[PDB]
Every structure is written in C-alpha cells, then in structure tokens.
Amino acid sequence: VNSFSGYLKLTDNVYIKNADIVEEAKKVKPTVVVNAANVYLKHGGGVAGALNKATNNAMQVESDDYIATNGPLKVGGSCVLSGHNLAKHCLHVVGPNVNKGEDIQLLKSAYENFNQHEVLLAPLLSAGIFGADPIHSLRVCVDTVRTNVYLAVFDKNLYDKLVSSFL
Numbered sequence: 001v002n003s004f005s006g007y008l009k010l011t012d013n014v015y016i017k018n019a020d021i022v023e024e025a026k027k028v029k030p031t032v033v034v035n036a037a038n039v040y041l042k043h044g045g046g047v048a049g050a051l052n053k054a055t056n057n058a059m060q061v062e063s064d065d066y067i068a069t070n071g072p073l074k075v076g077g078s079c080v081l082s083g084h085n086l087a088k089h090c091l092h093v094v095g096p097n098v099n100k101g102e103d104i105q106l107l108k109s110a111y112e113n114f115n116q117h118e119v120l121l122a123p124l125l126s127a128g129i130f131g132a133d134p135i136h137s138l139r140v141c142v143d144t145v146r147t148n149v150y151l152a153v154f155d156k157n158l159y160d161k162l163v164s165s166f167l
C-alpha cells in the first residue's frame with residue numbers, strides 16, 4: 001500500500017491523475033519525484049521551472065553545482081539529486097525536446113531511467129513545452145516502465161484525451 005490518492009489505474013504498474021506534479025509532491029512527499037529536465041539542468045518553465053520555484057530556487061543552486069562538477073546530462077539520461085521540500089529525491093530525466101530536433105526514439109531511453117526506482121511520481125516525458133505528442137509518449141511510458149509510476153498530467157483536456165484514449 002502507498003499514499004497516492006485519486007489516481008486512476010491504467011495497467012498493473014501505471015497510474016494517472018489530473019494534477020500539477022508539484023502539488024502531488026507537496027502532499028505525498030514521495031521517495032522520488034521526476035523532473036522534466038534539460039541537459040543543462042536549467043529549470044526555466046513547465047515541470048522544471050514549477051518544481052524549482054517550489055524549492056525557492058534550491059533545486060537550481062544544487063543543479064548548477066552538479067553541472068559545474070559533471071558537465072551536461074545526455075538526452076535520454078538522468079541524475080538523482082535532492083528532492084528538497086518536495087520529495088526525498090528528484091530524478092532529473094531528459095526526454096528529447098522536439099522543439100530542438102531531438103530523436104523521439106530517445107523517449108524510450110528516457111523512461112528506462114524510471115526502472116531504477118521502485119515507485120515514482122512523474123510527468124509525461126517530452127510533453128508540454130518539450131513538444132512531444134502525448135499519446136505516443138504514454139504508449140512509451142506503459143511499454144517501458146516496469147516499476148510503479150504515478151503520472152500527474154496538469155492539462156485536463158490532455159488527461160481527458162489520454163484517459164479516454166489509452167488502449
């Protein structure tokens with residue numbers, strides 16, 4: 001049993017809810033919240049800017065030190081950093097940004113990072129400002145992630161489309 005509430009079940013391991021991932025984090029304090037990161041961990045808008053704002057910029061300060069030491073992530077890659085006031089850990093995952101020309105095949109690689117964590121609160125990767133058509137992205141999450149993932153989708157019309165459309 002876990003603390004996630006109101007989520008609708010899609011599969012054995014994937015659950016979905018209309019909610020802001022940041023609000024899901026403050027209430028649940030999950031072990032892992034996933035950030036929709038870029039390779040520079042520059043948390044400017046969407047999931048990353050909203051998560052970072054909720055940490056009072058502590059996520060950005062920590063991320064700048066990580067990049068200064070390690071250099072940029074790979075598209076499709078991830079790193080584990082603090083969850084600050086939102087979660088124990090934040091898994092920063094880089095889905096491909098269609099609005100920068102990145103190979104959408106890298107979306108499966110991105111979601112494979114989730115399998116290193118037994119339970120996660122996450123957004124749909126490469127959705128929103130990353131330019132990623134959402135049905136494919138969900139078909140990839142369900143077909144890739146084997147661990148227990150609680151998806152918070154902020155746009156109700158998109159939630160509606162996905163929940164009303166998931167095969």
Ligand SMILES: F[C@@H]1CCCN(c2ncnc3[nH]ccc23)C1
Nearest residue numbers: 020021046047050128152154155
């Ligand atoms: F907005 C886009 C579209 C739907 C997905 N999405 C989010 N999903 C959950 N939580 C969120 N908080 C801030 C953004 C956000 C990004």
